[PDB]
Paper text:
Due to their key role in Zn2+ homeostasis, ZIP transporters are broadly represented in animals, plants, protozoans, prokaryotes, and archaea. In bacteria, there are two main zinc uptake transporters, the ZnuABC transporter and the ZIP family transporter. ZupT proteins are members of the ZIP family. Bacterial ZIPs do not have a large intracellular domain, but contain a histidine-rich loop between TM3-4.
In this work, we determined a dimer structure of BbZIP in an inward-facing, inhibited conformation. To overcome the non-outer membrane issue, we reconstituted purified BbZIP into the small amphipol PMAL-C8 to form BbZIP-PMAL-C8 nanoparticles. The final refined dimer reconstruction contains 37,954 particles at a resolution of 3.05 Å as estimated by the gold standard Fourier Shell Correlation (FSC) at 0.143. The dimer structure consists of 18 transmembrane helices, nine from each protomer. Cd2+ has been shown to help stabilize the protein for crystallization, so we used Cd2+ in our protein purification and found six Cd2+ ions in the dimer. In each monomer, two Cd2+ ions are in the M1 and M2 binuclear sites in the middle of TM2, TM4, and TM5 as previously reported in the crystal structure. The third ion binds to a site (M3) near the cytoplasmic surface that consists of residues Asp144 on TM3, Glu276 on TM7, and two histidine residues, His149 and His151, on a loop (residues 146–166) between TM3 and TM4. The cryo-EM density for the M1-site Cd2+ is much higher than the M2-site Cd2+, indicating a partial occupancy in the M2 site. His149 and His151 are on the loop L(3,4) which is disordered in the crystal structure but is well ordered in the cryo-EM structure through the formation of the M3 site. Two modeled PE molecules interact with both monomers and might contribute to the stabilization of the dimer.
Author numbering:
A (entry chain A), B (entry chain B): 6 to 309
The structure:
């Protein structure tokens, strides 16, 4: 029934976007090979403390999202300027954290492994390509809807709008957990603490906005917060996947440092810059973006 | 006549946006003080070779823009997907160049001067605030128009649309020259070469697009290229202003490294992300953005 209609929608979408389908296939192959290597290494070696660090970071992110959701029981449908400012701040946090904490350490580590020069750029750019292809294929092959743009993805008029919004949230929050797990891969707390702090700080307002939007869809007051907390609960799964793919051979650490980063950057544009830069809302979004950029800069230079 | 109407428009705009007016006043005061200090130092000390480097970099940028403009005599009104891809590539180049080449060296230099920790973040964040306030006040107090969004700024129905488009180009291209001049302030070719190469590479497609748009406004075929070359000629003035403000006392070097950077980041959003992320054009813009990000990464890790 539903499977048949979804399969037909997938086939019709594949007939229209071949390049994206090939990109998704290649990226999925790369990711599954990386995860197999990580599982093999986890079976042979002993890197359990890194798993502990990753799960604790995911738990912190989940707590931040849950707190942001619980903040929505008193605000009662905040205005649009505040929403634009908060989402711009979150986008700036994500962008700056990605750039600094997932390009500079990756370049240094890759230069250590292979030799300084263009080779480190090559490996981390391969990571960026993998991440972008994965996220693009996912957001074109997943039936979601955004709050303002509309219904994005394959057509399926057999599921309620709540599930489409939840899928949008899932797409946003997978790369964050992935990035946390990637960061704690090599120990070296000097990366994981800044990255995790930035992720939690930007997931507070995002969780609040998600709770408000899910209320707007129709869930009365008590089920929006539950779904926001559920997405927060999703984040540790991304943390586990990231720590799985970052282990294995040594060169798999720089590559992941790019992959997640690329995904994060991608999601921002393709999911966050629309709905924040739409129809004369650029000023507040830009101001929030710069404020988040500065705050992440402080965190980077201070926390480690 | 025209001065009276423009003055009335400015007063009406000031009655509506007080915070932006105060921000522009503070930023202008800071910039003029920095420039006075730079002029005094130039009169007392001997930093002429840095002026030579800055003017040569501005000349290279002007040549790149002129070549991009001359490329428009054969393309003859390229499609919209190509325009979105090129502008996304340019935005990615600007963003990545800003972030890396104007935050990391600035943080290192500030930490050298004042001490590692949050103090370097404080000084470069002051720079970011100054730059953002300057650019915001300018784009709200300047009668320009963007290609698609419409007529942005104070009302003045007494000048042709060509001048409004030229003013938009001027607003885009001032921070680029400023950044070049800031980069070559302390010698140390390891920054200026990557920053200048990125600026020239992203100003080729921008010059081509400007030539096409000015043709679309109505200039037949032979005057659009002239105006694009004129904006390229503008860029060295920004280079001179940047080298002027970056000289002076030592702590004026990190601050500028933030200022220009902030301005650059600002302009991207508030001027480039709209017109590239509008009405189902996100995919090509994002792909171009990631390609430009990777190319700037290569340039950073290789050229110096
Ligand atoms: C200089 C280059 C400036 C312009 C480059 C970007 C323009 C490419 C945009 C093409 C595009 O949008 O096509 C989409 C998919 O493209 C794609 O899927 C291309 C994916 C390429 C991703 C590359 C991003 C990271 C690159 C980093 C380098 C990594 C390697 C380094 C060693 C949609 O196409 P459609 O399928 O919908 O239908 C197409 C039927 N005409
Ligand atoms: C945590 C904070 C998250 C949210 C922060 C951003 C929200 C602020 C947006 C306010 C806003 O858009 O107002 C505009 C001008 O604001 C402004 O002009 C504010 C300018 C602030 C710029 C700060 C950007 C860089 C900050 C980096 C820190 C630098 C210092 C570090 C030591 C328009 O206002 P209007 O004039 O049109 O009318 C207003 C009459 N209600
Ligand atoms: Cd989407
Ligand atoms: Cd999240
Ligand atoms: Cd986020
Ligand atoms: Cd503007
Ligand atoms: Cd330019
Ligand atoms: Cd540019």
């Amino acid at each position: 029934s539903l499977a048949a209609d979804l399969r037909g929608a997938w086939h019709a979408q594949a007939q229209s976007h071949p390049l994206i389908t090939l990109g998704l296939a290649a990226s999925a192959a790369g990711v599954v090979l990386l995860l197999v290597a990580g599982i093999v290494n986890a079976l042979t070696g002993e890197n359990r403390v890194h798993v502990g660090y990753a799960v604790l970071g995911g738990a912190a992110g989940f707590a931040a999202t849950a707190l942001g959701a619980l903040m929505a029981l008193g605000l009662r449908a905040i205005s649009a300027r505040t929403q634009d400012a908060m989402l711009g701040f979150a986008a700036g946090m994500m962008l700056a954290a990605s750039a600094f904490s997932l390009i500079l350490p990756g370049l240094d580590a890759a230069g250590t492994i292979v030799g300084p020069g263009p080779a480190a750029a090559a490996v981390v750019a391969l990571g960026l390509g993998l991440g972008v292809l994965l996220m693009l294929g996912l957001d074109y092959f997943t039936p979601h809807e955004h709050e303002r743009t509309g219904h994005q993805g394959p057509e399926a008029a057999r599921v309620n709008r709540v599930w489409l919004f939840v899928l949008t949230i899932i797409l946003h929050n997978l790369p964050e957990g992935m990035a946390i797990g990637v960061s704690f891969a090599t120990g070296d707390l000097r990366i994981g603490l800044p990255l995790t702090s930035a992720i939690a700080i930007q997931d507070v307002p995002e969780g609040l906005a998600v709770a408000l939007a899910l209320r707007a869809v129709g869930l009365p007051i008590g089920r929006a917060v539950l779904v926001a907390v559920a997405s927060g609960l999703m984040e540790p799964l991304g943390a586990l996947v990231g720590v799985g793919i970052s282990s294995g051979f040594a060169l798999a650490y720089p590559i992941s440092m790019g992959l997640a980063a690329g995904a994060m950057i991608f999601v921002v544009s393709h999911e966050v810059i629309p709905e924040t830069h739409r129809n004369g809302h650029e000023t507040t979004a830009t101001v929030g973006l710069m404020a988040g950029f500065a705050l992440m800069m402080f965190l980077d230079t201070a926390l480690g």
